[PDB]
Design an enzyme around this catalytic site. Structure first.
Site, PDB file in Angstrom:
ATOM      1  CG  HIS A 144      -0.903  -5.636   3.674  1.00  0.00           C
ATOM      2  ND1 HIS A 144      -1.742  -5.799   4.752  1.00  0.00           N
ATOM      3  CD2 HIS A 144      -1.080  -4.362   3.253  1.00  0.00           C
ATOM      4  CE1 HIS A 144      -2.365  -4.659   5.001  1.00  0.00           C
ATOM      5  NE2 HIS A 144      -1.990  -3.774   4.098  1.00  0.00           N
ATOM      6  CG  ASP A 198      -1.936  -1.139   1.169  1.00  0.00           C
ATOM      7  OD1 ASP A 198      -2.351  -1.550   0.059  1.00  0.00           O
ATOM      8  OD2 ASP A 198      -2.323  -1.611   2.258  1.00  0.00           O
TER       9      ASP A 198
END
Length: 442
Positions: free
Chosen positions: A230, A216
């Site tokens: 992630h 992100d």
């Protein structure tokens, strides 16, 4: 999914810059494709909807296999981009309207390469990725997101022969949330046990989720922003069921294959509440556009090293602005994502370090080495009302407890039915995308 014959697929042209040194860049003639979830799904030899509102047709789709045989997704013509989906391009700027009135809510899109037949895959290790953004019209409850995921370049066409559209039709979406709301997974309708989401007239959840690694760059509105790693084990697109999805609803958030929380650097959550906000006396003024620069540092400074650090800085009106720092007693003043920052801050917050369990920065880097697809989106949050981004989470938590307060938004904010009225005309703009060696994009 089969491909329908009712409308040609026409992605929006979006040039980006590929750079070799500061102010020495060349244009790459890329394009933007709409995610297959937003497409009309109808009978292969007709006009009859296979999916309407938030339900599949049970006669056409009694099983996923039958659904897939009977149904097809159709193209987005140029006229429909603005009129139906709220997407437009002016030069090197891409705009996504939140609500477009027959009424469309949110959007997710991907960057195609110059052939317009594959996603533009970015090998991000030892590189810098940069863009200009305007989130001034996004308030509490909304998110204009720019991020990378470990989708296949062909959306899975080679793996799943029932996927006829591939990247050209925005197929193969996966992310670190292992979402069940994806309508087409592994070339098949995700129609088994399909359940509407209450208070979401357009969406539901199927039997399977779709997992993959996620980086992100930008989760944000005008009140709060974050960047987050992630990793997953493995990183590549993986259809999930049961515990592997790590479903929130069954208490499995930390039992699945993906790190759902991720390791975040969110300035406000890290206890600098004056760095970013909607006004000229914040360090970075979210009422005006600005440049977001991301540098992916490796252990040896080469493309073969392990990912070690996600660095960030900003440029606004020609003023270079370094990232904010972690601001808690007895904690190092980190200004980037590293394994140590993740361990220290999650330790302080009392958050389980699933990032480390999933292989940490090194594992995140392996996804980045193979190449990731660029995603640009605008959305509200029917699960948690975006409170994780911009408010207190949990809402009942003490805001003075480190990790709880992520922004100034009230805990009553972000209810989709309210934000879809109040912020109907919100528009995120992403533009002047630049990619190259470290130090090359400004």
């Amino acid at each position: 999914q089969n491909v329908g014959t009712q409308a040609a697929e026409e992605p929006l042209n979006l040039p980006i810059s590929v750079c070799t040194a500061p102010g020495n860049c060349q244009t790459e003639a890329d394009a933007v494709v709409l995610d297959s979830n937003w497409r009309w799904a109808h009978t292969t030899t007709g006009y009859t909807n296979c999916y309407t509102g938030n339900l599949w047709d049970t006669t056409l789709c009694p099983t996923p296999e039958t659904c897939t045989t009977n149904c097809a997704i159709d193209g987005v013509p140029l006229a429909d981009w603005s009129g139906t989906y709220g997407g437009s391009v002016t030069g090197n700027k891409f705009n996504l309207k939140f609500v477009t009135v027959s009424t469309n809510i949110g959007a997710r899109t991907f960057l195609l390469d110059s052939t317009k037949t594959r996603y533009r895959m970015f090998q991000l290790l030892n590189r810098e990725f940069t863009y200009d953004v305007d989130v001034s019209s996004l308030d509490c409850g909304l998110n204009g997101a720019l991020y990378f995921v470990s989708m296949d370049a062909d959306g899975g066409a080679a793996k799943y022969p029932t996927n006829k559209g591939g990247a050209k039709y925005g197929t193969g979406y996966c992310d670190a949330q292992c979402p069940h709301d994806v309508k087409w997974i592994n070339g098949l309708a995700n129609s088994k046990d399909w359940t509407p989401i209450p208070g979401d007239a357009n969406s539901g959840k199927g039997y399977y989720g779709n997992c993959c690694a996620e980086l992100d760059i930008w989760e944000a509105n005008k009140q709060s922003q974050a960047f987050t790693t992630h990793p997953c084990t493995p990183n590549d697109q993986t259809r999930c069921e049961g515990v592997v999805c790590g479903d929130n609803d069954s208490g499995d958030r930390y039992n699945g294959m993906c790190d759902k929380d991720g390791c975040d650097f969110a300035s406000y959550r890290m206890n600098d509440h004056t760095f970013y906000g909607p006004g000229s006396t914040f360090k970075l003024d979210s009422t005006k556009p600005f440049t977001v620069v991301s540098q992916f540092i490796t252990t040896d400074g080469t493309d073969n090293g392990d990912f070690k650090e996600f660095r960030r800085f900003y440029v606004q009106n020609g003023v270079r602005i370094e990232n904010s720092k972690v601001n808690f007693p007895g904690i190092t003043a980190y200004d980037s994502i590293t394994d140590e920052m993740c361990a220290a801050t999650k330790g302080l917050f009392g958050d389980l370090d699933d990032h480390k369990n999933k292989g940490g920065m090194k594992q995140m880097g392996e996804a980045m080495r193979k190449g990731m697809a660029l995603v640009m989106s605008i959305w509200d949050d029917h699960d948690v009302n975006m409170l994780w981004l911009d408010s207190n989470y949990p809402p009942t938590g003490n805001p003075s407890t480190p990790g709880v307060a992520r922004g100034p938004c009230p805990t009553t904010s972000g209810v989709p039915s309210e934000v879809e009225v109040t912020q109907a005309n919100a528009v995120v703009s992403f533009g002047n995308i630049k990619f190259g060696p470290i130090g090359s994009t400004v």
